[PDB]
Amino acid sequence: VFQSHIGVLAFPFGTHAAPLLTVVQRLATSSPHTLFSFFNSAVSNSTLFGVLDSYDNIRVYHVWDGTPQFTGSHFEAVGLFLKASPGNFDKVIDEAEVETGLKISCLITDAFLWFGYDLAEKRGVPWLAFWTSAQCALSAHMYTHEILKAVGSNTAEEELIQSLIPGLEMAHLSDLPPEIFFDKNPNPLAITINKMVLKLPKSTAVILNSFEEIDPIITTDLKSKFHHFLNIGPSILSSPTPPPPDDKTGCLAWLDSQTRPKSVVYISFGTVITPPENELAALSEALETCNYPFLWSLNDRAKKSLPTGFLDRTKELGMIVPWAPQPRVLAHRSVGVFVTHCGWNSILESICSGVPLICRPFFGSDHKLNSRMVEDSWKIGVRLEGGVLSKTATVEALGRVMMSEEGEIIRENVNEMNEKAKIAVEPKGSSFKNFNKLLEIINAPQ
Ligand SMILES: O=c1ccn([C@@H]2O[C@H](COP(=O)(O)OP(=O)(O)O[C@H]3O[C@H](CO)[C@@H](O)[C@H](O)[C@H]3O)[C@@H](O)[C@H]2O)c(=O)[nH]1
């Protein structure tokens, strides 16, 4: 017998849908008189959907992704999806209400889906926005109007941000998400993100898979901008997953064979980016030179293009796989450092295991800002000389993290940040309390 019905609208691209589903599952676990309907593309849903994931109170729906009836590009697909919005979702929300017999009482959406505000307003329900990155990235976007008003789109560098954005004084204009400055015939995603900024102050709550204590001053600032600003993470600590009885990748058996704690260099650039094959070569040379053991998530093509005899010579030193069980890898006692593209989920996984970072961010999104925070605010890792994996830059970064006095300070900082994350999700912790507040908002008087 359900009393409340929460509609949840995902953004079906990048690493957006999974973190939102995780929050839905956490809320569903605690909300047995509340029904949750999750709306996403059929293609995304087929990647996301065992005993702990079969909820009596979660229904899954597909919405039209806007493609004709993929042959075109990821870029193309995102534009068609946004062109079909919000009518694609509106039609399916009706179906969920008819099938369940319960009108929606609340709408949670990815924060990118600005039109969640319009759908919630039309239905006379609260809109809750789930931001899929850290507070620092959200703050950068929220100051878009003030940034553009101060310096325009086309002295400002290292003066404006330190005067304007609480807690981002260490960031440069060139660290900020580039979509802030894309206002000439903006692409559909830039349009969507700038409409998000305009709507978010009319959210009933903004929800983050972060913890307040990673950036107290930014958190306090954003609490002043939003009705409710609710850091509820890290989800991976609040809500662990039982260890799978096996690991078909071989990674964990290989890490178990390592004889030195904190010795292994784990390398991943995410699900999409591959560095250019001359940068992969430079990294391969640094690994052979430094003789740290390594575990590298790299696609089989890129691997086949590494330098002649590198794979044969390093057979007994490193393991290269097309996919790693990354959270399980980072939790392994043998891992000493993570060479990352500075995606938020990767950084947060690293914090949650006390693994320091070597940062190689690529263009777009919040990766460059995250790299700045890692080196100059959080102080849980280092960036590279020239922002590339040159052999000299890579040997230098590995030395700074693995065998310097600066390295010992970085490891105390990442251990302290791990402790703050754990405290946040335990009873009386900031994230624990914020998640109870979120339950009060969604489940209403009861
Ligand atoms: O072999 C691998 C490689 C990656 N991962 C996982 O893949 C995810 C990668 O996510 P993330 O580190 O956040 O990278 P991006 O998806 O590039 O992240 C950017 O884009 C996301 C939306 O697409 C935003 O939510 C992020 O904040 C933003 O930083 C993580 O959970 C990793 O554990 C694996 O499990 N195995």
Residue numbers in the entry: 2 to 50, 53 to 72, 76 to 160, 165 to 456
What sentences appear in the manuscript?
In plant biosynthesis, the formation of glycosidic bond is usually catalyzed by uridine diphosphate-dependent glycosyltransferases (UGTs). In this work, we report an efficient phenolic apiosyltransferase GuApiGT from G. uralensis, and dissect mechanisms for its sugar donor selectivity towards UDP-Api through crystal structure analysis, theoretical calculations, and mutagenesis. GuApiGT could efficiently and regio-selectively catalyze 2″-O-apiosylation of flavonoid glycosides, and showed strict sugar donor selectivity towards UDP-Api. This selectivity was highly related with the unique 45-amino acid PSPG box and the key RLGSDH sugar binding motif. Through theoretical calculations and rational design, we altered the sugar donor selectivity of GuApiGT and Sb3GT1.
To further prove the critical role of the RLGSDH motif in UDP-Api selectivity, we conducted site-directed mutagenesis of Sb3GT1. Based on structural analysis, we inserted a serine residue into the motif and constructed the 375S/Q377H mutant of Sb3GT1, as well as the F372R/Q376H and F372R/375S/Q377H mutants. All the three mutants could catalyze kaempferol into its 3-O-apioside, according to the characteristic [Y0-H]- ion at m/z 284 in LC/MS analysis. We further solved the crystal structure of Sb3GT1 375S/Q377H mutant in complex with UDP-Glc at 1.43 Å resolution. The motif structure of the mutant was larger than that of WT, which may be critical for the sugar donor selectivity towards UDP-Api.
